[PDB]
Amino acid sequence: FGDIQFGKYLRLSCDTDSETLYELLTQHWHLKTPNLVISVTGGAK
């Protein structure tokens, strides 16, 4: 758990389900979405 300063990060298992993650990320945190943009890159150093 825990905030980060130099966001609110989280370490989590690969095998958890997305719906309670969504309940966390929308209820305890900010609101919903009219849009969701994904940008895939990360093999580029």
UniProtKB/Swiss-Prot annotation:
Where in the body, by tissue, does this protein show up?
Expressed in dorsal root and trigeminal ganglia. Specifically expressed in a subset of pain- and temperature-sensing neurons. Not expressed in heavily myelinated neurons. Not expressed in neurons expressing TRPA1 or TRPV1.
Q: Which domain of life is it from?
A: Eukaryota
Intracellular or extracellular location(s)? Cell membrane; Membrane raft
* PTM section of the record: N-glycosylation is not essential for but facilitates cell surface expression, multimerization, association with lipid rafts and ion channel activity.
Describe the outcome of a gene knockout. Trpm8-deficient mice have severe behavioral deficits in response to cold stimuli.
UniProt family annotation:
Belongs to the transient receptor (TC 1.A.4) family. LTrpC subfamily. TRPM8 sub-subfamily.
Q: What is known of its domains?
A: Cooling agents bind within a pocket formed entirely by the S1-S4 helices that opens to the cytoplasm. The coiled coil region is required for multimerization.
Q: What does this protein do?
A: Non-selective ion channel permeable to monovalent and divalent cations, including Na(+), K(+), and Ca(2+), with higher permeability for Ca(2+). Activated by multiple factors, such as temperature, voltage, pressure, and changes in osmolality. Activated by cool temperatures (<23-28 degrees Celsius) and by chemical ligands evoking a sensation of coolness, such as menthol and icilin, therefore plays a central role in the detection of environmental cold temperatures.
What subunit structure does UniProt give? Answer: Homotetramer. Interacts (via N-terminus and C-terminus domains) with TCAF1; the interaction stimulates TRPM8 channel activity. Interacts (via N-terminus and C-terminus domains) with TCAF2; the interaction inhibits TRPM8 channel activity.
The protein depicted here goes by the name: Transient receptor potential cation channel subfamily M member 8
Gene behind the chain = Trpm8
The full protein's residues present here are 103 to 153 of 1104
